[PDB]
Design a protein around this nucleic acid. Sequence first.
RNA 1: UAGC
Length: 1264
Amino acid sequence: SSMILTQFGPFIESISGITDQSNDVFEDAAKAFSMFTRSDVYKALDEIPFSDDAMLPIPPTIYTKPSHDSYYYIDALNRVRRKTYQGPDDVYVPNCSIVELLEPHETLTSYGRLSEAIENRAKDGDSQARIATTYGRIAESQARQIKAPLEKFVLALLVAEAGGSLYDPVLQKYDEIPDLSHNCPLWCFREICRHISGPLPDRAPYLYLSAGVFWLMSPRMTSAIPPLLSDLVNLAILQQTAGLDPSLVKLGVQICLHAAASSSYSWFILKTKSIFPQNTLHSMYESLEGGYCPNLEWLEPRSDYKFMYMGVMPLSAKYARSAPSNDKKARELGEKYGLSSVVGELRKRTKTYVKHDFASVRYIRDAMACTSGIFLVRTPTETVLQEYTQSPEIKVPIPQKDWTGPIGEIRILKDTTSSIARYLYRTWYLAAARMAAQPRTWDPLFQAIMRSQYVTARGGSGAALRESLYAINVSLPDFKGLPVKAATKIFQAAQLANLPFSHTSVAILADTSMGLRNQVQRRPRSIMPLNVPQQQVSAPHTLTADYINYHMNLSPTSGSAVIEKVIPLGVYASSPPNQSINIDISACDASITWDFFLSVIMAAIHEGVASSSIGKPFMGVPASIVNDESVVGVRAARPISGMQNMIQHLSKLYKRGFSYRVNDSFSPGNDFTHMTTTFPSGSTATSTEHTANNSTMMETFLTVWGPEHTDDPDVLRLMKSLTIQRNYVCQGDDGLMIIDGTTAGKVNSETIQNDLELISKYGEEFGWKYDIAYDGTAEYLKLYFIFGCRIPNLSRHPIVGKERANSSAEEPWPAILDQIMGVFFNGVHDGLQWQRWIRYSWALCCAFSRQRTMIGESVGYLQYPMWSFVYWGLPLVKAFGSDPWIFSWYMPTGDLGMYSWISLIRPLMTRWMVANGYVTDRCSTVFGNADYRRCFNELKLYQGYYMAQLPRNPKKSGRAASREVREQFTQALSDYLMQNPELKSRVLRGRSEWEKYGAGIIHNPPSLFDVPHKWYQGAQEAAIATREELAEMDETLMRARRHSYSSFSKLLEAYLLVKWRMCEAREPSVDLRLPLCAGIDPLNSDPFLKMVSVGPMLQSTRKYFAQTLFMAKTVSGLDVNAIDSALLRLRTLGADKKALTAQLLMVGLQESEADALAGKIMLQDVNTVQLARVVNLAVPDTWMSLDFDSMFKHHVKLLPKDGRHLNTDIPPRMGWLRAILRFLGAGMVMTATGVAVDIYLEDIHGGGRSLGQRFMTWMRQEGR
RNA sequence: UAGC
Ligand SMILES: Nc1nc2c(ncn2[C@@H]2O[C@H](COP(=O)(O)OP(=O)(O)OP(=O)(O)O)C[C@H]2O)c(=O)[nH]1
Ligand SMILES: Nc1ccn([C@@H]2O[C@H](COP(=O)(O)OP(=O)(O)OP(=O)(O)O)C[C@H]2O)c(=O)n1
Ligand SMILES: [Mn+2]
Ligand SMILES: [Mn+2]
């Protein structure tokens, strides 16, 4: 550690709260990090005096593996294939030797890549060589699934931990987290690597580079080492940052060692990934004595996902685990994978927890962070053959006699059918009828929005489309000479802009390009990038599904972020006396096929949409005539609407299937088109469509099937009390059945058990394998709940992992900084120990803040000041002589965050500056007699501040674009969007109108006329950048670093004029004995105190924020939040109604609607969150789990604590000020470590009137 | 070639 201490000494102290932070120390540490060689990190690791408790037997078979050759073969189709040994799954990268297939590197002599000799032979066609290349390429691919070299994460850990225990400001004592000599993962990482390198000077087992991956030329290396080491690094860091229990951590190291020990690391990891969850989470409290769980009320209407805390629910034996015991299967699983030692130890400990509290949920949490975090990987060929193969087993087919004759491509489900499809057809027909009945549906704007949905900078199988068209002799414009990426649906849009639907129809049957996705703890999944025509024709399906989800069921449309997965619902569902069944349908996409679902859905839509769409086109598609054979004998032609014409063509595609074109870059010679009946995932229908069928079938069960298949009085009662509108929440193939409890306690376990079994049997009837889980736990959208307590699953957020499906290289340097920051926020949302996490993050950041730059022998260095990270969100540990750890990780981001920490130590800063020579005669309103201008330039605070706001990736704009083709393109884009003359006309009105009532007031008028321009830029920025464009980006960051400044942003200089008074601590909003999120307990002071004082966010953030906008959606390309800002800004700038009416017309609204909304906007009382956008203030993501709405409303007093002040009074017409002011008060409160306090407006320098004009100036100047 |  002397090697680490000597080199990072001062820095270590600055991030441990012993000494102040400063850019000089920081940048020097950065330079030290940059000059540490890989092998030096292993040397540093050797200096560590590991304890015996940190050691465990390392399996010798981890080093001696067979040849890859016996693990592959060539099939009847000549494609290289993985040869199965452990079962159908055994398709991943096998654990084998690899050195025998390498050629030493020219320079890094001890490292090697795949023999170029082997590849050429493979490219020739040699079977043995192909096998070898494939294994070589996939093994490498498995190794690329990480953010950067493992040594950087390790080094930062060394630096951070060299600081020793941290003193808690609140608890007023040092934490007791074991030091590194007790870190078992680290010991393994060192020993495993040392054993491989052996007598070699190079200590790294492999090198993660740009030129690819290189293996250390040791006969001891294995294709399983990269995954293994990556797993150990994650555990190593968490044992120190999440305060994980070391005894548990060793259990996780064992599974991993067993994984590398097996014949296929990934396969093994996959087959055992439920060990920790099963022997802890899903087995808690078989016995229960005490503890408290939340008591929540689900407000009406349940669709709002809005809840209210009502105190605590005392627990007792009355609530012990009633769900079936998983013991048997659990022990079996352990026995089958040689892990019965671990499974047993876990069962033993789980039984010792007889009280529900912080301690026990922390144990579950700790247990679950130990699961491997690797992104499983296998060759494309295999994913495609394993995912587009299985077909649903419809145990009860829809009788052939139940269909009418054809009506084009569809057949009507006779209403005489006794098939369960009867009800599936009803829901969709009904929905379709109501959707097409809506006036909005026929509005030129809505149809424009729809048509813009799939016009994105993403792929759409462009090549296959261009050739399907060529087959009918139709050539698309090539826009030869444009600097935009051609494989964008945006490019596609332009090529089709001026072509009749009848000419592009054939494209609906074009092939589909390959697209893949690797996931943590899951198998890779293939994706279907549908083309514009295919997406167009899919509309009716998508809209009818949306109509169902919005009006007929209880469903969520969530993303991937924890902030949007409705946490409140899980707390409710899992709190006794409530119970929940976690439903999931396995092989969902393979389950939605023509034979049952699609052939019925198409018919339903096509018929329920008939009368309202009659005699009308839709989204570009024309009406037409189709052959009719419904009735027997009677065979005529039928006039169908454009909307119907879509279903007509879509039905044709759903019937034929999809031609998945597989170009496997990992398996030489594996080129082939595979036809599959699996449902498309890249379809705009996918998600919404699966959510609708889900709830529809559940409705049919509870309402029809169920009741008809059982006379059990209780099961019938339980069922009757369940409605899909109140008790069943779902998204996609995920379902959460919430059985509310009574005063008599919870519903009988045996009656629930009976119910479930009927659901299972019910699904076999239409080819759906329900994966039902009834274990006392609530699990929805990978969010884990128990007794009202949310259990973060850390294993799913690998600190070093990163998905990399394609062979393409990682993004140039700067890019990694955004990834590092994301790692930090995860740690916040996941509840890691705040001080330990913040310190490590500073280590990690410093370690990635410097990059070597080239300009042609002009070897300089790019360096981000420590201040840039603050701008990005990382809280300061100690600065300007302040006390240590006064800043919380809930500190806002950007300007709002800068204002907050600076406001919290204004005096401190001023005093410090003066005491160091930065004195002046001019008294600053904010910093008194401090020479802040000279100070902030010298500390690189201004520099860091501005550098933070610069693009972290190369810009492609500015590439030479021959004006003429440049105009042809944006024209086609325009035509696509401006298909319907009525819409264009709407915008032209908005324009001439704008020139009379709005032009001049603001300068950001959003307009549909901009979209074509934004679309072009998007297609541009999607293209690969040049080394030149890369040099330009550096120069930019480096120019801002040289430049010196005299102020911050106009907005921030305004916030600084506002002073506050921090007061008495708030009272608890929830019981302090109440577990809400494992990890957030009295051992994690700041996160905890904030949780208790501020309160948890009990409403769905998606539903909440949807209430802060006048318009939900707009044409893709424009920003709903932008539009909201312009309208409110015009109003604040005193613009006339007519002016707002003009803006709305420029974005697509019909005058009637425009004038109505404009008039409505004018008189509304806009809420804090919505109003604060006029000045670009946004609720920090980190705050999303807290009740920020209460804070704004009841704990940020704008009335000075001691009465009215002249400066504090708010001018009549400047009420909007109060909203901006609220964000500033909360910003300081949330940034201050400890309990939320009540902050009181103390002062506004030039007064509120001056402040308002100041903000108005910024407003009217945006975009000039 | 890399989707919603
Ligand atoms: N349409 C669509 N749905 C997605 C996507 N990613 C996830 N989902 C949906 O949300 C669900 C949760 O998926 P996961 O893949 O577990 O993502 P995650 O939510 O980020 O998991 P984590 O807990 O580790 O943060 C599965 C699926 O129905 C995506 O890219 N597109
Ligand atoms: N990047 C992703 C990931 C998932 N999905 C969609 O999510 C849906 C179901 O989610 P999973 O449960 O994750 O997929 P399954 O195929 O059902 O997994 P398996 O039975 O193990 O659960 C189907 C799939 O198309 C998607 O469109 N895009
Ligand atoms: Mn599933
Ligand atoms: Mn699912």
